[PDB]
Design a protein around this ligand. Structure first.
Ligand SMILES: [Zn+2]
Ligand SMILES: [Zn+2]
Lengths: 6, 177
């Protein structure tokens, strides 16, 4: 799951 | 232009990486964590799921519930169990298994967990901190109850650091000096 954090 | 969250309809900047948003693995668009009704803890856990579990926006979701949702719910419960199981199966925690919801022992945390009462990492951590801290406060002049207490504590802090890197057990309100 891609997030702004990753 | 095409940069707007589908759920709230508001614009987002290609450069604000302090924003809490997830990227749909299908169409590549971004969606606010808060618009999917996700707490910051959930967002962190998601940022930890395997590269194999992609977030998926509503319209790109074919079958509901969206798989990322069930995967997310399972991940929290499995991770919490992962930690508790290690605490339970350790030879250093034997004295905190049974006291002799606000559980006063690990068997109690165990029951509170299996019944699905933990919805956050914070409540689970705080319940354990209280139990560990209580043992520390009453282990007057005696090791393995003082020694063990510190290695179940170090053990707890480290185990939690492994499963929930983004979470701080050290800052818990229930620790005493
Ligand atoms: Zn939004
Ligand atoms: Zn999509």
């Amino acid at each position: 799951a891609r997030t702004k954090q990753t | 232009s095409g940069n707007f969250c589908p759920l709230c309809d508001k614009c987002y900047d290609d450069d604000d990486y302090e924003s809490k948003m997830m990227q749909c693995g299908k169409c590549d668009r971004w969606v606010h964590s808060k618009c999917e009704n996700l707490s910051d803890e959930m967002y962190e856990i998601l940022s930890n799921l395997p590269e194999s579990v992609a977030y998926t926006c509503v319209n790109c979701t074919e079958r509901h519930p969206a798989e990322w949702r069930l995967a997310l719910e399972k991940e929290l419960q499995i991770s919490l169990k992962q930690v508790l199981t290690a605490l339970l199966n350790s030879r250093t925690t034997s004295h905190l298994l049974r006291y002799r919801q606000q559980p006063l022992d690990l068997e109690g945390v165990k029951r509170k967990m299996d019944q699905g009462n933990y919805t956050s990492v914070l409540e689970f951590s705080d319940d354990i901190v209280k139990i560990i801290q209580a043992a520390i406060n009453s282990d007057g002049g005696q090791p393995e109850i003082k020694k063990a207490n510190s290695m179940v504590k170090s053990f707890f802090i480290r185990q939690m650091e492994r499963v929930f890197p983004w979470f701080s057990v050290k800052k818990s309100r229930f620790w005493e000096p």
